[PDB]
């Protein structure tokens, strides 16, 4: 019943409501994910959790299906809607096609949903970017991202959120076959990228790994602190 055009074209050909939604993801927590050759790992920084807060309820990494998971940046309330819509779609693909959802398909759904909210009456765009991660029933690992506009691309490694520019350029330098050799080293690349923005993590780092064999494994502040020390004797190995 409320049919008011929210997102419109500007004199110079811009969509301000979309760009403003892209400013909202800029203010959000830093989210980074890298694609290895056996495991895909994503992690979120810029936490600043009040300690007095239950850290289990504020997780920014969410599982969508048995094989697909995602992280986000921006308006946390907006993401919860998108995640729920994405989860429903994962089961709806199984009721119609029987075959489980592919990583590209679920990304295409999220992107089309966000796009529909930039070209509809009475609706406002989603203020989130999502990093979609999973494995095809093929063997090949996948990493995708979306943004408020509804454009999606595949990435070898990508970062969105607060200081995405800084981590993006750290990854461009540090992303080589040597950095993604084994499981441990691909995880190290994520954390080393997070230490570029976060004020010494371990407590301020949430990260999860996914293999083609098992489901999602969220690492606890005990297993994360192990990598803090393993890279520290790499950093302090100059002498």
């Amino acid at each position: 019943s409320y049919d008011r055009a929210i997102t419109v074209f500007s004199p110079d050909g811009h969509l301000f409501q979309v760009e403003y939604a892209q400013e909202a993801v800029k203010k959000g927590s830093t989210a980074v994910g890298v694609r290895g050759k056996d495991i895909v790992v994503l992690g979120v920084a810029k936490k600043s959790v009040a300690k007095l807060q239950d850290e289990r309820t504020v997780r920014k990494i969410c599982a969508l299906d048995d094989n697909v998971c995602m992280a986000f940046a921006g308006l946390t309330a907006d993401a919860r809607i998108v995640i729920n819509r994405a989860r429903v779609e994962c089961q709806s693909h199984r009721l119609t096609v029987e075959d489980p959802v592919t990583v590209e398909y679920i990304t295409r759904y999220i992107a089309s949903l966000k796009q529909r909210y930039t070209q509809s009456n009475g609706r406002r765009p989603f203020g989130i970017s999502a990093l979609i991660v999973g494995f095809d029933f093929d063997g090949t690992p996948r990493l995708y991202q979306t943004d408020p506009s509804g454009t999606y691309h595949a990435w070898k490694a990508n970062a969105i959120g607060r200081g995405a520019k800084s981590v993006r350029e750290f990854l461009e330098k540090n992303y080589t076959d040597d950095a993604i050799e084994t499981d441990d080293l691909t995880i190290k690349l994520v954390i080393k990228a997070l230490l570029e923005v976060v004020q010494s993590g371990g407590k301020n780092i949430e990260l999860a790994v996914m293999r083609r064999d098992q489901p999602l494994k969220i690492l606890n502040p005990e297993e994360i602190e192990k990598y803090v020390a393993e890279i520290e004797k790499e950093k302090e190995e100059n002498e």
């Binding site: 599982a63 969508l64 299906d65 729920n84 989860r87 429903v88 994962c90 089961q91 709806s92 199984r94 009721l95």
Partner: protein
């Protein structure tokens, strides 16, 4: 015509179903599975109408899986059976009523083993043992005869075997093989298929 059976012990639930999919006078399939995995510890055994069986059981299956993804944990056997019953009860007076006689088996973290019987009218009931199909008429009395709550799983299979052998002797329909599964604290276990 299809067959379901469930036997509950102190810490397990034993379920079995025939592997026959028939059309009028012919057996079209020899290895048909009438069991639907809902959770790691819940099975839904669905029997009845040609179209309704797959459509209904699968709809509940993906909803429980959606719940798993939504909240991080799984539904209890009690909550699952009530969810299935609600969806069946609501459709009963609607334009598309599902004619399915089903049997839900599960193991709970705190409550333990659970077996539920359900009418096509959507009447839910908890039983130590239950059976569906024409074969139920021949077997239920054998269950009443040789059942104690303290039955071990290996003697529950013997009890199940007594029931399936009766279906070879008296039941006029050809039912050679049966799918056998057990649910306990470790999850769902595949057993040796009983053949004749």
């Amino acid at each position: 015509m299809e067959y379901l059976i469930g036997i509950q012990g102190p810490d397990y639930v034993l379920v079995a179903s025939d592997r026959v999919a028939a059309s009028n006078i012919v057996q079209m399939k020899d290895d048909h599975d009438k069991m639907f995995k809902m959770s790691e510890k819940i099975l839904l055994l669905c029997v009845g109408e040609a179209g309704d069986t797959v459509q209904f059981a699968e709809y509940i299956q993906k909803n429980v899986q959606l719940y798993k993804m939504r909240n991080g944990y799984e539904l209890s056997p009690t909550a699952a059976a009530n969810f299935t019953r609600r969806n069946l009860a609501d459709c009963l007076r609607s334009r598309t009523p599902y004619h399915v006689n089903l049997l839900l088996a599960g193991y709970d973290e705190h409550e333990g083993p659970a077996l539920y019987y359900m009418d096509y009218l959507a009447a839910l009931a908890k039983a130590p043992f239950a059976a569906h199909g024409y074969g139920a008429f021949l077997t239920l009395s054998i269950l009443d005869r040789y059942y104690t709550p303290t039955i071990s799983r290996e003697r529950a299979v013997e009890l199940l075997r007594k029931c399936l052998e009766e279906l070879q002797k008296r039941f006029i329909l050809n039912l050679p093989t049966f799918s056998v599964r057990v649910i306990d604290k470790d999850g769902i276990h595949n057993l040796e298929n009983i053949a004749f």
